[PDB]
């Protein structure tokens, strides 16, 4: 689905409800019926309702890369003057929110609308067709959304406790709707490590195999230790499905949603991420992640780390300046000195962040971000280019979280943009190489 | 106030936009404190096209000119001598902020400087000629005016220049609760405020014009500009800021411009943010907003059209701006006034009739 | 198999679709050209073989009677 | 583990404008739910009356200014959107403004007709000069919630009236917060409940409450 | 020939093509799209345009 | 041949157009290339010279490898043994192949590259 | 759409039509040919 | 804003379901958190947190002296009323440590509680479940543009 | 004062244990508002009678295991909490399991004193393997709500007093969502879908009445301080 204007949607099908409110006696003549759609009385939107129904409508944002850039949706009437597009389809259409727009277009002689549904379909396309890999796959919300929901807290809260001497093991749930009941009082924890019997789920593969081995459970109920939100994580994949049980990495969910595709037709698939979306969604909130000047830190080695290379520069500085060391060799130095240097700081970067900590989730998780990303907020920039293309030996000590300096700004500047002005010509050189391959 | 300032290669007698190469694009030493490397465009024109810094200042002969505080002998004088890019290069450039030592010397066992590389050295304060008159000699005005500067990577901040020459001024315009130094003093030399040019006290205070009786016995007068449409379509609406026994000094400010709250540029709202994600509506980007800002029309602004007709003289006859329309009914001219022009003050709907106007025809059939 | 219930584009399932035609292109023309023949009908003529819905579209109809097996085609 | 002490619900005092109020006991986490299903109805479908159009004689619009007037036409607008009225009357009453002279104009200075008040008479709308003539009759109806300007185009109106967004909403800021307990242990939830003084928070909850419980239904 | 020449160095080809009196054929996909003709594939293809669809004898029974 | 569609998962069908598929396949990356990059790739699909030519043996046997400063001298001895094939001038800058890096004695292939740097199609 | 008939057959872009003829201004003899009735005309 | 953060207006809420400060001050605004961390523009949180500070004032501790993050030359800014504005000059403005001591100030909303924490954050209420959201959030003030 | 419509409420059978209601049309946005605050009421405001601790026989200082028996104590335990009785007593009663048969036990062994009835007969208990006896007895207290295992430090005198999790609300699950309707009339007005899976002892009418009324009810501490302003019915 898409959401769509309905002032837009009344001008897209203009001729088509014309002959229905025709039909209808609302309009006597195609006369009164054309003034009745151009002065909006509110008797067509009711009419509009009814043409649109089932009726697909293509969805295309320019630059379009690959064939996925145009996808058939089916319209919803959408209060505003905006589109509303499924947050799925953004990484096919490279849709950013920061004010793109998207042309509708109106598919109308029959075989144009089997096409659309058949060929074009939203749904029908999931994986790329170059790589066969998941494009709907979730991303960057909904990737830690889930991530946190999969995620196993040691000593949570009402962890299971394997009792011992005199108290039953307490860590042990009739059904999943009563760690839910638990939870919503403080007794359950959704990350926490108890162990539950289900009745509704389908256990992994080696442990089905000796539990059973005469058959599944639809109904036959049996156990395992999980994280109550790994039982829901499992609910929103098909009942058919074995159980995971693992918090899920980005990778780890491409591997499930690239298996449904192979085991399961396309609207189990559709229907599939659906479910995972929502899920997503509701607990990415939920999370708990947020950004401060708090839960951005900076390694207390970075001082002594920083101060003893410079030394070690200070030193080759001294033996250039002494006049026997090579220019070329010098700078070279120096260029290998901090280079490696940057690393430490990263090393003892990661090393000091808790690993619940809201900026490393992001990363971690494979929502977005990278840690040489995480290198230049916190610790140290790190080295910069020159104009020339060469390595400026002048390092950047401070970070983006401490602020540059009136020199280390105007010196990032002369490399930062390099690198937007590169993207600019980038485009324009790989859209002409992509005419010819296509020619 | 950033087009005028602009800077641009293009045109006849230099580069042309599509010919150039990339070796002009990119920012060069002798930039600092003459064109700001951080505003320029994010498209095609990168590099070609840049705002001239806030100090700097033209030669004569057409080469940018930067003020300096020569320093001789570890002490930083009071001489403030403006240098062309030429003679910069032959001198040693101390920095902008330097620890200051009582009356005026270098306190700093070393001090940075600048270089005809240019290069970035030391000296025990002994070798620098001149300093840097203050920190965002190399910025621009736009530049200057984004809090936290020093933080945020070129990237983002090139765009965040660009943006507020994107501003639409809103109805309230509520000045920026953190901002920079640059705030009251670009308003005033935009031109959109009204400034009081001579001492006095003010005789009326009107929506329509402002009058002040000068201390010379002399009286000036400002008329208001109120709800102009501006080239843009945005609203240039002007408001008055005294009362009528007020007392002014020369160079104050009488009257807010449309981006402007007590002589200082603003340029939005200030908003209670929370930077949670929020049910997949605040995502990608995308923003959610409280219905408040809405009701109590903190984001609204006004715009402005302007349609034009003539009546002309054709071959066939003579134009004519008229309320007799050939085939219409007597409702849809129910707005038109005797002439058949829109009547001040009526609603206007997509396809209405703002001037009945008719021509000639020939030989129907 | 339990994959849910389909909301109106999405149904019938292609899967379901795909085992009565040789491709999604064939399909496509079968559907096509069934379609514009029941639209004609409410002016070939024949159909609606499947209990027409409450004011179903007729390309909606041809999808519907092609998953049934109501009717047979031959590639050309 | 039946425990049975009906819910108690007494009243408080902290304000004159808001006051807080206290429902004890109740089963463990219910307060939270509660608090915001009061909240909720409280922010939004409480009744109250507020002004719907204004007509200002020499202004055919709102984009112009008034001879002697320091404030346009579109910044009084604005002004007169903070007026806190109540109309216990139902059937649109047109309200009356008329100044001559310098001075400042206030919401005191509006007669009210027939069982209408103005509530915050202390407001500022415009200052006028010894040129500066004000007339302006203003509409009051009664409703709930937020409705946007209604365009005289699609009402009755004529080229004079100026339409106003209206805003019914006698709360102004509310919140709450519960206490737990850890004998069994029950929640009681405590509320404050802040109004505009069309209305005193007494009167405000007990309109969300019948307007609460008329909904709940079986 | 119609093809090159909407590709690349028209004058070149269209030159080239007069002399040598070409003719195309209009079989690749870029012709047909010029000139308004269903492209030779997907949907476009002889086999899947040339479908005939009826009715089952024993649907129409039915009815 | 061309075998399972990746959009489909399944064998691609018979109306498909895998020639666009493949040029939008190759090309929509191409915004991520640093550009070792799109020149490159340009390069080979124009099948251009390389860049710096690189040399590929010509025939199978040992090699016997010399330094003339300031440049190469790579000779391969056949096992046929027949006519010696010398590669006269390689600039030191281009530097050898690794299996490590080639070293005199050696074997060959027929068509292994001599030195790092791209191998000229046409001429394999 | 008005009448609810059936969408018709497309026709020949006239786009296409005005290329022939800046071809023929070139002193380009462009001829559309039928399979086997060699010669068509564009009216 | 003005640090090239950019988006469209995605959804608005009624004033009645949004997060709430425990005062019963709904947010105006809520930004996603996925976005700040990778385009390295920290300083529209560090605003952020500014942001804050003058609109709800703040007051240095008196006791005994100036604690130790003050006594880099800041003069006079150690009381400052609410609603007061700010000026941090680009590469002049205010340090990461000024901040944080900071960030614990002055607390009125009427009452004498604390709305935001010394890590910029606040326990903010859904509007639409009418339950507390499970961590601290980042609440404060921004400068956006139309 | 205030007129609107119109709400309506719908109900749809997905078994004989769970049934999804939906009301339509809603005012923007009530139907977030009381969405959750229902969720609370049929979760933890419905009276019922649940098991609170149970001891069985040859357990004292045992960890876990019970000889005679495929189940073990764990087993058991969330074998038994599955036990639905409704019980007039409103105090705590003893009922009585004891079997040594070698044959499955269900819910039907047990016998309920006068006042407690089982709705869940065919209900297992335990495999009794061959020659084995099994006795256990069951405190049943009414309550409402889900109340955790509670050791009061009395539990500690009891030697083999196992303390159990107790369901005491009908209802072991329930969940929302909201959706918009009204074509043109209203424009994107809310619908609220409320899934309710009961147990046995009340079916998920009663369930929703029973919420219904104990929610009118709760509201009407307010709507006495006046009564003055009013809605729409
Ligand atoms: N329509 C294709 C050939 C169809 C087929 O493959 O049979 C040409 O022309």
């Not at chain 2, 025990?124 to 000629?129: C, G, N, R």
């Given at each position: 689905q898409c959401g769509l204007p309905k002032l837009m949607a009344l001008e897209l099908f203009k001729p088509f409800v014309m002959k229905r409110l025709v039909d209808l006696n609302?309009?006597?003549?195609i006369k009164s019926a054309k003034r009745m759609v151009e002065r909006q009385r509110p008797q067509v939107w009711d009419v509009l309702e009814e043409v649109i129904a089932e009726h697909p409508v293509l969805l295309n944002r320019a630059p379009?890369?690959?064939?996925?850039?145009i996808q058939a949706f089916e319209p919803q009437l959408v209060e505003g003057k905006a589109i509303q597009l499924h947050p799925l389809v953004c990484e096919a259409f490279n849709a950013?929110?920061?004010g793109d727009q998207m042309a509708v277009h109106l598919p109308l002689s029959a075989e144009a609308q089997a096409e659309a549904r058949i060929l074009m379909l939203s749904s029908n396309?999931?994986?790329?067709?170059?790589?066969?890999?998941?494009?709907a796959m979730p991303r960057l919300d909904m990737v830690t959304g889930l991530y946190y929901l999969t995620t196993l807290v040691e000593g949570?809260?009402?962890?299971?406790?394997?009792?011992?001497?005199?108290?039953?093991?307490?860590?042990?749930?009739?059904?999943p709707a009563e760690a839910i009941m638990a939870m919503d009082?403080?007794?359950?924890?959704?990350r926490a490590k108890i162990k539950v019997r289900l009745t509704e789920l389908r256990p992994p593969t080696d442990l089905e195999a000796q539990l059973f081995e005469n058959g599944w459970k639809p109904g036959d109920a049996w156990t395992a230790e999980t994280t109550l939100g790994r039982v829901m994580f499992n609910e929103?994949?098909?009942?058919s499905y074995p159980f995971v049980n693992e918090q899920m990495h980005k990778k780890v969910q491409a591997r499930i949603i690239n298996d449904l595709a192979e085991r399961f037709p396309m609207i189990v698939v559709a229907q599939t991420v659906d479910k995972l979306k929502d899920a997503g969604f509701y607990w990415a909130t939920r999370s708990g992640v947020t950004v401060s000047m708090a839960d951005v830190l900076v390694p207390p080695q970075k001082q002594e780390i920083l101060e003893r290379h410079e030394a070690e520069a200070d030193a080759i500085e001294r033996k250039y300046q002494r006049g026997a060391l090579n220019h070329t060799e010098r700078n070279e130095s120096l260029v290998k000195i901090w280079q490696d240097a940057t690393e430490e700081v990263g090393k003892a970067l990661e090393e000091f962040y808790?690993?619940?900590n809201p900026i490393i989730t992001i990363v971690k998780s494979g929502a977005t971000g990278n840690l040489t990303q995480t290198r230049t907020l916190a610790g140290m920039k790190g080295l910069v280019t020159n104009?020339?293309?060469?390595?400026?030996?002048?390092?950047?000590?401070?970070?983006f979280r401490e602020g540059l300096t009136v020199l280390e700004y105007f010196i990032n500047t002369h490399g930062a943009r390099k690198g937007l002005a590169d993207t600019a010509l980038r485009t324009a050189d790989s859209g002409y190489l992509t005419r010819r391959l296509v020619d | 106030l950033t087009h005028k300032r602009r800077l641009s290669a293009?045109?006849?007698?230099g580069l042309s936009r599509e010919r150039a190469g990339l070796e002009v694009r990119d920012v060069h030493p002798?930039?600092?404190?003459?064109?700001?490397?951080?505003?320029?465009?994010?498209?095609?024109n990168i590099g070609l096209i840049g705002s001239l810094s806030v100090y700097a200042r033209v030669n004569p002969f057409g080469f940018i000119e930067t003020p300096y505080r020569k320093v001789e002998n570890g002490v930083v004088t009071d001489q403030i001598d403006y240098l062309t890019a030429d003679e910069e290069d032959r001198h040693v450039v101390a920095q902008a902020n330097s620890p200051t030592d009582e009356?005026?010397?270098?306190?700093?066992?070393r001090v940075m400087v600048r270089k005809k590389g240019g290069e970035v050295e030391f000296v025990?304060?002994?070798?620098?000629?001149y300093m840097d008159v203050?920190?965002?000699?190399?910025?621009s005005v736009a530049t200057a005016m984004?809090?936290?500067?020093?933080?945020?990577?070129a990237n983002r901040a090139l765009m965040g220049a660009n943006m507020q020459r994107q501003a639409v001024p809103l109805v309230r315009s509520e000045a920026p609760l953190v901002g920079t130094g640059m705030e009251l003093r670009a308003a005033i030399d935009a031109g959109d405020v009204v400034v009081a040019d001579k001492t006095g006290v003010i005789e009326e205070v009107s929506a329509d014009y402002i009058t002040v009786m000068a201390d010379d016995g002399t009286r000036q007068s400002y008329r208001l500009r109120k709800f102009a449409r501006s080239n843009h379509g945005t609203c240039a609406n002007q408001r008055p800021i005294?009362?009528?026994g007020q007392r002014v000094e020369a160079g104050q400010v009488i009257a807010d411009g449309p981006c402007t709250q007590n002589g200082e540029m603003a340029l939005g709202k200030n908003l209670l943010v929370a930077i949670m994600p929020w049910e997949?509506?605040?995502?990608?980007d995308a923003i959610i907003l409280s219905n408040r800002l809405v009701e109590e029309d903190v984001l609204t602004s006004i715009h402005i059209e302007e349609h034009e007709i003539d009546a002309r003289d054709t071959k066939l006859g003579a134009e004519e701006i008229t309320?007799?329309?050939?085939?219409?009914?007597d409702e849809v001219l129910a707005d038109l006034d005797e002439r058949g022009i829109v009547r001040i003050g009526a609603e206007v709907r997509?396809?209405?009739?703002?001037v009945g106007k008719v021509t000639p025809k020939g030989e129907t059939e | 198999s339990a994959y849910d219930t389909p909301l109106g584009i999405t149904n019938p399932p292609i899967d379901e679709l795909l085992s009565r035609a040789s491709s999604k292109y064939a399909l496509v023309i079968y559907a096509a050209k069934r379609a514009r023949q029941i639209n004609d009908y409410y002016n070939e003529y024949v159909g609606p073989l499947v209990e027409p819905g409450?004011?179903?579209k007729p390309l909606s109809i041809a999808l519907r009677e092609i998953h049934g097996d109501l009717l047979e085609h031959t590639e050309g | 583990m039946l425990i049975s002490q009906r819910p108690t619900l007494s009243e408080e005092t902290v304000a004159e404008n808001r006051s807080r109020f206290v429902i004890e006991?109740?089963?463990?986490?219910f307060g939270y739910t509660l608090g915001n299903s009061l909240r909720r109805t409280l922010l939004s479908s409480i009744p109250g009356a507020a002004v719907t159009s204004i007509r200002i004689?020499?202004?055919?619009?709102?984009f112009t200014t008034v001879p002697?007037?320091?404030?346009?036409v579109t910044d009084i607008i604005l002004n007169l959107k903070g007026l806190v009225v109540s109309s216990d009357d139902d059937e649109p009453v047109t309200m009356y403004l008329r100044k001559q002279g310098p001075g400042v104009v206030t919401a005191g200075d509006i007669v009210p007709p027939a069982?209408?008040?103005?509530?915050?008479?202390?407001m500022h709308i415009a200052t006028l000069n010894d040129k500066g003539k004000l007339e302006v009759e203003l509409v009051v109806e009664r409703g709930r919630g937020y409705v946007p300007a209604v365009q005289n185009k699609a009402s009755?109106?004529?080229?004079?009236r100026i339409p106003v967004d209206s805003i019914y909403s006698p709360v102004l800021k509310v919140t709450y917060k519960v206490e737990a307990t850890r004998r069994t242990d029950f929640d009681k939830l405590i509320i404050d409940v802040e109004t505009?003084?069309?209305?005193?928070p007494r009167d405000a909850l007990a309109s969300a409450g019948g307007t609460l419980v008329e909904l709940f239904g079986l | 020939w119609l093809s090159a020449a909407s590709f690349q160095e028209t004058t070149r080809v269209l030159t080239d093509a007069a002399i040598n009196c070409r003719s195309d054929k209009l079989n690749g996909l870029k012709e047909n799209v010029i000139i308004g003709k269903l492209i030779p594939?997907?949907?476009?293809i002889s086999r899947y345009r040339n479908i005939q669809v009826q009715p089952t004898e024993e649907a129409r029974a039915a009815a | 041949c061309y075998g399972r569609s990746m959009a489909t998962g399944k064998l691609v069908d018979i109306?498909?157009?895998?020639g666009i598929v493949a040029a939008q396949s190759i090309g929509?990356?191409?915004?991520?290339l640093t550009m070792g990059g799109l020149p490159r790739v340009q390069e080979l699909f124009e099948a251009r010279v390389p860049r710096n030519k690189a040399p590929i043996a010509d025939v199978a046997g040992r090699v016997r490898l010399e330094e003339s400063d300031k440049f190469f001298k790579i000779t391969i001895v056949p096992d046929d043994g027949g006519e010696e094939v010398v590669y006269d001038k390689l600039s030191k800058r281009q530097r050898l192949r690794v299996i490590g890096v080639l070293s005199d004695g050696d074997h060959v292939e027929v068509?292994?590259?001599?030195?790092?740097g791209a191998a000229d199609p046409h001429e394999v | 759409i008005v009448k609810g008939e059936n969408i018709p057959e497309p026709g020949i872009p006239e786009s296409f039509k005005v290329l022939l003829k800046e071809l023929q201004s070139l002193c380009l003899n462009v001829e559309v040919l039928?399979?086997?009735?060699?010669a068509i005309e564009m009216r | 804003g003005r640090h090239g953060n950019k988006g469209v207006i995605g959804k608005i809420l009624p004033v009645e379901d949004m997060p709430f400060l425990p005062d019963g001050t709904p947010v105006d605004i809520i930004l996603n958190t996925?976005?700040?961390?990778?385009?390295?523009?920290i300083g529209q949180i560090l605003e952020t947190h500014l942001g804050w500070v003058a609109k709800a004032g703040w007051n240095i501790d008196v006791a005994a002296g100036v604690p130790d993050w003050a006594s880099k030359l800041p003069e006079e800014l150690y009381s400052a009323p609410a609603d007061s504005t700010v000026a941090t000059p680009v590469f002049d403005g205010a340090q990461e440590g000024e901040l944080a001591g900071l960030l614990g100030s002055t607390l009125p909303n009427?009452?004498?509680?604390?709305?935001?924490?010394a890590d910029g954050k606040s326990t903010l209420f859904d509007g639409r479940s009418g339950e507390p959201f499970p961590y601290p959030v980042t609440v404060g003030y921004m400068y956006i543009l139309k």
């Open positions: 609302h309009a006597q003549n379009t890369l690959h064939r996925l850039g950013d929110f920061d396309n999931i994986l790329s067709p170059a790589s066969g890999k998941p494009l949570a809260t009402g962890e299971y406790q394997a009792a011992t001497k005199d108290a039953p093991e307490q860590g042990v749930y009739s059904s009082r403080g007794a359950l924890s959704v929103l994949l098909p009942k808790p690993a619940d104009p020339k293309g060469e390595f400026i030996p002048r390092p950047i000590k401070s970070s | 293009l045109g006849p007698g002798s930039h600092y404190g003459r064109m700001c490397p951080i505003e320029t465009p994010e498209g095609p009356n005026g010397r270098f306190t700093e066992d025990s304060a002994d070798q620098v000629d203050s920190p965002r000699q190399m910025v984004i809090p936290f500067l020093e933080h945020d990577d005294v009362d009528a997949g509506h605040n995502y990608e309320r007799d329309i050939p085939n219409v009914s997509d396809g209405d009739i703002l | 409450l004011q179903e | 006991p109740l089963e463990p986490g004689d020499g202004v055919l619009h709102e002697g007037v320091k404030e346009d069982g209408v008040t103005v509530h915050n008479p202390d009755g109106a004529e080229i004079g505009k003084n069309s209305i005193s | 594939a997907g949907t476009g | 109306g498909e157009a895998v929509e990356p191409g915004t991520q068509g292994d590259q001599l030195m790092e | 039928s399979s086997d009735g060699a | 996925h976005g700040v961390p990778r385009r390295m523009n009427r009452d004498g509680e604390v709305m935001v924490d």
